[PDB]
Amino acid sequence: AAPTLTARLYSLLFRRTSTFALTIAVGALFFERAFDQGADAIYEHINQGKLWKHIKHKYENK
Amino acid sequence: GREFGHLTRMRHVITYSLSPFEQRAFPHYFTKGIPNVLRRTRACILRVAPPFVVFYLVYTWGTQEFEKSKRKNPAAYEN
Amino acid sequence: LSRFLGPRYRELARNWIPTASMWGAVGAVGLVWATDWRLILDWVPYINGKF
Amino acid sequence: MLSRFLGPRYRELARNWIPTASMWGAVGAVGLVWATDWRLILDWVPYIN
Amino acid sequence: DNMSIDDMMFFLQGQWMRLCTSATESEVVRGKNILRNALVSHLDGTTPVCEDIGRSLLTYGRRIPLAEWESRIAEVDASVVREVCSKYFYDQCPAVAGLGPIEQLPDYNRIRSGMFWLRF
Amino acid sequence: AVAASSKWLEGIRKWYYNAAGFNKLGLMRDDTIYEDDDVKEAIRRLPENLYNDRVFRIKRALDLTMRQQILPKEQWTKYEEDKFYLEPYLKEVIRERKEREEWAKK
Amino acid sequence: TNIRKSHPLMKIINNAFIDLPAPSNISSWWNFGSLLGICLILQILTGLFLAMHYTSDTTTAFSSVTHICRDVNYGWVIRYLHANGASMFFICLFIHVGRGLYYGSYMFLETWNIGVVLLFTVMATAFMGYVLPWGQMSFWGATVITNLLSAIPYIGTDLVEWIWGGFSVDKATLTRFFAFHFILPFIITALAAVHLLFLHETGSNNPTGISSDMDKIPFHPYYTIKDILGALFMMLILLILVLFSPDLLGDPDNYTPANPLNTPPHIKPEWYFLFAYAILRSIPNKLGGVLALVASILILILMPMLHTSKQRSMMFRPLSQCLFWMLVADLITLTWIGGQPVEHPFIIIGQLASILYFLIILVLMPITSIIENNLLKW
Ligand SMILES: CCCCCCCCCCCCCCCCC[C@@H](O)O[C@H](CO[C@H](O)CCCCCCCCCCCCCCC)COP(=O)(O)OCC[N+](C)(C)C
Ligand code: HEM
Ligand code: HEM
């Protein structure tokens, strides 16, 4: 059958090791921010109200 | 040294492999292993369980018994 | 030291440049990713770990 | 198992080499007397002090 | 010889990679000249060329004339060489066979390891 | 002195024969023994026809355990079938070791 | 021309970690020794970052530990990693001894003995580092355990006086232990390198026990990724036991500052020593308790001579393997008896547990090995 988007994607970045390392780098850069902030907003979301960052309001900006 | 280039005699034994890329990583990886796991299990549970169960029994044996020599004392010491 | 000089060597370096230059770019951006370098992070629309 | 050492040639080796054993053992004994300041045997010899 | 088995291999795959990255044109013309000599050397005699007629027709059809072959040898360039070699040598799964004794010879992955330079 | 009871001995040696797992891998009893240097030299004594058989069976089992999967139910060795080929070799190794020792003691 | 075979150092690594021949049928148990090799360096750097604050003074140390747990930037992680990580070290180490004993890799005599000396060394480093944090268990524990050598009719009571550098635990004795504690691990490294160096030139053991010289297989393509996976999963064990169980692993009481004055209720020695300490309860006369204490580790040396069963291993012999599991269970016994505060039933159980702990290998194992030999013409 016709090559999968993954298939041509091999012929792209994977087969060449430099570009391979490159996509590893950009991939790290995205996985960092996205997963990091995901763990942020989720951890903020689960045991809600235990957080003082939402309880800053008793004492902030008068 | 003892490296591969000179070792034991071995003859007309032959190998059939495959390129890793040509084959998928998990060939019936589930269904094949479970009976194997369970058979290894029934094989050695017979030789593994009894020390640990005997240990657990002696554990609660001494804990509960001495505890009975312990909490129960004021009646044991009488008035 | 003069040996480095040569007709193939010119063509050869010409050939090897993409692979090693790519590494430098990969090494540079990755190193920015590792030290979490500042001023370029200013220039990224997405990965602003700063508020 | 251990019967192989139990032979007249080896018991012979025992009779031959025993005085030497007493020799070296006495040497290290004296070394204990000296280096460790083992005064108890230093006391056996008057010349000390 | 048993003790150098890996060693020839140790170099051989490099040769393929050598053909990949950094294939000098001087090497290219070397190979082309040896090729042309291989053709003309094959084409001496009656039987070999009766065979050429007897197989070229089964192949392309045609006797496929030498003017075409040598136009096609002049056709080749180091860029094209590196491309094709890339399309077959650079990262592709080997099919390997041995009859020895073999023992020094690397296991498939290790053999497979050589098809791609870590440097490229 | 045992005689009449020997049957039952064989009746548990077989269980003992089952007790070991080598039959499940089908290996010769002789294969199981540890290779100290003298018995190694007894291995050296073996004919090639017998030698390579041993080597191959051993490699089969070695492949199995890597998979952990056991050798197939049909193929499992019978207590009779396992020729104890190494007997002359090892018994002569014993006789010779104890020989040179027997001279060494006098 | 050849690159790995070019440079002689590279020649050495290629004779080893790059491509030493190895048996193929290896399981995780052999991965564990490599796991020890994993833990070691981690403790070393971790202890380095800790060594950037801790003091060996009798007075100022504990305040610096509090400097670690509260002041230092993520250093608390480091603190617990060095502690709990050492705990993990002993974890893997015990499995490893169990393996070498089980698959009979003790047949490699010199390698085995270097393993033994390495073991005593690790024990000492353990004890002294445990003395370091400087708290109630630290103090009274170190005092009590040190007292044991005084069981010697002459020399040992003198010797304790020599360690302490004074009448009692003090900046003398504490700095003493800080320094011994520091010098030993680096020794452990060299003993490790020497240990592997004995291992390479005999070949590795295999799960079968029977030689796999015919089946030797390259290291780099295979076992490297295997052990990487194994180290990553131990990293799971450790990180889950530290980020989710920060404290439980040890003995709270050290959390109290030490007082020569104030005296702790129970002074349970830290858990890896518990079986050893249990043996201190075993018999009358402190002297013989010390003798049996050292003998508990020393006894391992007898085994290669005590070994006589035709296996180089213990997997095709569930018979003797059963005695084995009785012995392991016996270790569990000495463990939990050592954990409890001292009591009479615990005393008798500890007695028979100790007698049987020696006799399984001084009586049962060799002789049953003989009858097992009688059953199949061995
Ligand atoms: C000791 C105490 C515990 C340690 C705790 C750490 C635990 C670490 C465990 C994590 C696992 C790491 C896995 C390693 C991944 C790759 C392993 C190896 O098998 O893959 C190789 C492949 O290698 C990788 O592809 C190279 C990736 C390059 C990325 C390098 C990372 C750079 C990090 C630099 C550090 C920056 C921080 C600096 C701070 C000072 C094999 O190549 P191959 O399977 O054939 O496929 C590629 C074939 N090609 C070339 C044709 C495509
Ligand atoms: C952390 C320090 C140690 C290191 C680095 C070390 C090397 C470890 C490792 C790396 C192995 C090789 C198997 C493997 O992991 O793949 C094993 C080699 C060996 N060690 Fe140690 N060891 C250490 C402490 C001990 C102790 C205390 C003993 C008990 C006596 C011991 C007995 C062995 C044996 C028998 C081998 C040979 C490997 C085999 O035959 O399977 N080791 N250990
Ligand atoms: C495997 C061998 C080692 C053992 C068993 C050992 C003992 C470990 C353990 C158990 C801790 C104690 C933490 C605590 O009890 O709270 C730490 C004690 C200590 N070790 Fe080591 N250590 C070892 C190698 C090192 C190395 C190489 C260094 C330095 C580079 C080091 C620096 C420390 C420090 C500072 C402490 C006291 C920490 C505290 O007060 O909590 N250790 N390490």
Contact flag G2-E107 (C-beta cutoff 8 Å): no
Report the alpha-carbon distance of residue G17 to residue G220 in Å, rounded.
7
Annotated catalytic residue: which of G87, G138, G212, G227?
G227
Q: Whose CA is nearest to atom 32 of ligand 1?
A: C30
Q: At what angle do helices B29-68 and G318-339 cross, to 10 degrees?
A: 50
- Catalytic, G5? Answer no
| Residue type, position E50, single letter | C
The verdict on whether residue G56 carries a ligand-binding annotation is no
Minimum-distance CB partner of G316 among F32, F63, F84: F32
Contact of F22 with chain B, judged by CB distance below 8 Å, is answered with no
Phi, psi of G217 (to 5 degrees): -140, 150
Report the alpha-carbon distance of residue G47 to residue G184 in Å, rounded.
13
The answer to whether residues G133 and G68 touch, using CB atoms and an 8 Å cutoff, is no
Strand partners, G217: G22
Question: Measuring CA to CA, which residue among F89, F76, F40 is closest to residue G211?
Answer: F40
Report the alpha-carbon distance of residue G306 to residue G294 in Å, rounded.
19
Report the alpha-carbon distance of residue G100 to residue B74 in Å, rounded.
51
The answer to whether residues G39 and G92 touch, using CB atoms and an 8 Å cutoff, is yes
Residue F83 in tokens:
């020729």
Q: Report the chain E residue with the minimal C-alpha distance to residue B18.
A: E108
Sequence-distant (6+) residues with CB within 8 A of A36 are C49
SS3 of residue G85 by DSSP: helix
Contact flag E120-A15 (C-beta cutoff 8 Å): no
Contact of A36 with chain C, judged by CB distance below 8 Å, is answered with yes
Phi, psi of G22 (to 5 degrees): -140, 150
Chains C and E touch (3+ CB pairs under 8 A): yes
Cβ-based neighbour number of residue G178 at 10 Å: 22
Cβ-based neighbour number of residue E17 at 10 Å: 21
* A chain contacts of residue C33, beta-carbon cutoff 8 Å: 25, 28-29, 32
SS3 of residue F101 by DSSP: helix
Residue G31 in tokens:
């991965």
Burial (Cβ within 10 Å: 0-12, 13-18, ≥19) of residue G106: buried
Element (H, E) at E86: helix E78-88
DSSP state of E117: -
What Å resolution does this PDB entry report? Answer: 4.0
What stretches of G203-343 adopt beta strand conformation (E)? none
The verdict on whether residue G313 carries a ligand-binding annotation is no
Residue G185 in tokens:
């691990």
Quick one: how far is CA G20 from the chain centroid? 27
- Catalytic, G226? Answer yes
- Catalytic, G227? Answer yes
Angle at C16 between CA C12 and CA C20, to 5 degrees: 150
Question: Measuring CA to CA, which residue among E83, E97, E84, E94 is closest to residue E116?
Answer: E94
Report the alpha-carbon distance of residue G205 to residue G99 in Å, rounded.
11
Q: For the residues of G90-151, what is the DSSP string, one character each?
A: HHHHHHHHHHHHHTTGGGSHHHHHHHHHHHHHHHHHHHHHHHTT-SHHHHHHHHHHHHGGGG
The answer to whether residues G135 and G143 touch, using CB atoms and an 8 Å cutoff, is no
Number of alpha carbons in the 13 Å side-chain half-sphere of residue G69:
11
Report the alpha-carbon distance of residue G124 to residue C40 in Å, rounded.
52
Looking at the CA of residue G227, tell me the nearest atom of ligand 2. 16
Q: At what angle do helices G75-102 and G219-243 cross, to 10 degrees?
A: 130
Contact flag G218-E110 (C-beta cutoff 8 Å): yes
DSSP state of G24: S
Q: For the residues of G179-244, what is the DSSP string, one character each?
A: HHHHHHHHHHHHHHHHHHHHHHTT----TTSS--GGG-B-HHHHHHHHHHHHHHHHHHHHHHHHHS
Distances (CA, A) of G326 to B42, B48, E108, F28, G100: 19, 9, 44, 29, 17
Distances (CA, A) of B38 to B34, B41, G145: 6, 5, 47
The verdict on whether residue G195 carries a ligand-binding annotation is yes
SS3 of residue E21 by DSSP: coil
Instruction: Report whether residue G236 contacts ligand 1, using a CB cutoff of 6 Å.
Output: no
SS3 of residue E84 by DSSP: helix
- Catalytic, G63? Answer no
> Any idea which residue has 């796999």 for tokens?
G212
Question: Measuring CA to CA, which residue among G261, G264, G257, G260 is closest to residue G61?
Answer: G257
Distances (CA, A) of G261 to G132, G139, G142, G258: 19, 11, 15, 9
Instruction: Report whether residue G199 contacts ligand 2, using a CB cutoff of 6 Å.
Output: yes
| Residue type, position C17, single letter | I
DSSP state of A12: I
The answer to whether residues G198 and G111 touch, using CB atoms and an 8 Å cutoff, is yes
Question: Measuring CA to CA, which residue among G269, G263, G258, G58 is closest to residue G165?
Answer: G58
Element (H, E) at F106: none
SS3 of residue G22 by DSSP: strand
DSSP state of G77: H
The verdict on whether residue G141 carries a ligand-binding annotation is no
Q: Whose CA is nearest to atom 22 of ligand 3?
A: G129
Cβ-based neighbour number of residue G204 at 10 Å: 19
Contact of E79 with chain C, judged by CB distance below 8 Å, is answered with no
What stretches of chain G adopt beta strand conformation (E)? none
Contact of F78 with chain B, judged by CB distance below 8 Å, is answered with no
Technique used to solve these coordinates = cryo-EM
| Residue type, position G39, single letter | C
Residue D45 in tokens:
């010899």
